[PDB]
Design a protein around this ligand. Structure first.
Ligand SMILES: N=c1c2ncn3c2ncn1[C@@H]1O[C@H](COP(=O)(O)OP(=O)(O)OC[C@H]2O[C@@H]3[C@H](O)[C@H]2O)[C@@H](O)[C@H]1O
Length: 252
């Protein structure tokens, strides 16, 4: 109508068929995911939020889905990222030097989608879904990404990398999922170093954003957990992706 229940956009159109097709396509491509039954995955995904109030979702709601989506990722090749999606994916696409949450079955299923249900019924709400800020944080989409981001950070070991958007006013944002979940769920016993790549947005090689106050906050939080912190500027992200493509690439 002219007034919806919630402030967020409604469930993505054909959400069930989309998630199911994504699960088929993923499990056709990635061999270690062939034990996976896609119907079972869809059932467990729906079970997490159908007939539930979309402001009352918990991590336990998603545990069936997580169990079914159990997947080993090489623990020393994890790339976290915050607010700079395209480059993180273009980078891992070149030769799978690293793995992001969207390279995992569950991350691939949900990327770019929105979903919610209703307390009273088993219908998907295609009209509107809770906004994290205005309506509630414990909504189906936010709780899903907290839960999966928590388990992905827990699986990391050795050197873990994070790409950060250096054109935001908060390069490191303590309120982002990276700042509120990932940094606190790396296991210090297993993780030697968190290495941030701060992605520049223009000019080229301007300031040294590894000196930015928020990066200094990040370094102190990480160092206080007994994990070493490293930071690198990527001044020209275009030149960086071409260098990744053209190994022994005459400047890379
Ligand atoms: N792939 C998505 C995604 N695709 C669309 N969206 C995604 N949220 C998180 N993820 C992944 O979870 C991670 C944590 O997300 P967060 O930083 O909270 O997203 P924010 O920068 O806070 O963006 C969150 C918003 O963007 C929508 C969600 O429907 C919505 O919540 C992201 O870095 C990304 O890896």
């Amino acid at each position: 109508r002219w007034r919806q229940t919630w402030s967020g956009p409604g469930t993505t159109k054909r959400f069930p068929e989309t998630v199911l097709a994504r699960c088929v396509k993923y499990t056709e491509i990635h061999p270690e995911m062939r034990h996976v039954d896609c119907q079972s995955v869809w059932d467990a995904f729906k079970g997490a939020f159908i007939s539930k109030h979309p402001c009352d979702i918990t991590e336990e709601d998603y545990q069936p889905l997580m169990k079914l989506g159990t997947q080993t990722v090489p623990c020393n090749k994890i790339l976290l990222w915050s607010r700079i999606k395209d480059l993180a994916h273009q980078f891992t696409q070149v030769q799978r030097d690293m793995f992001t949450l969207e390279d995992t079955l569950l991350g691939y299923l949900a990327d770019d989608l929105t979903w919610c249900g209703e307390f009273d019924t088993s219908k998907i709400n295609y009209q509107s879904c809770p906004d994290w800020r205005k309506d509630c944080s414990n909504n189906p989409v936010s709780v899903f990404w907290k839960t999966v981001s928590r388990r992905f950070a827990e699986a990391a070991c050795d050197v873990v990398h994070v790409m950060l958007d250096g054109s935001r006013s908060k390069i490191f944002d303590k309120d982002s999922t990276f700042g509120s979940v990932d940094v606190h769920n790396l296991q210090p016993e297993k993780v030697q170093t968190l290495e941030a790549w701060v992605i520049h947005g223009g000019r080229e090689d301007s300031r040294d954003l590894c000196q930015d106050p928020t990066i200094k906050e990040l370094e102190s939080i990480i160092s206080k957990r007994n994990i070493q912190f490293s930071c690198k500027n990527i001044y020209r992200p275009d030149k960086f992706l071409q260098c990744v493509k053209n190994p022994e690439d005459s400047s890379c």
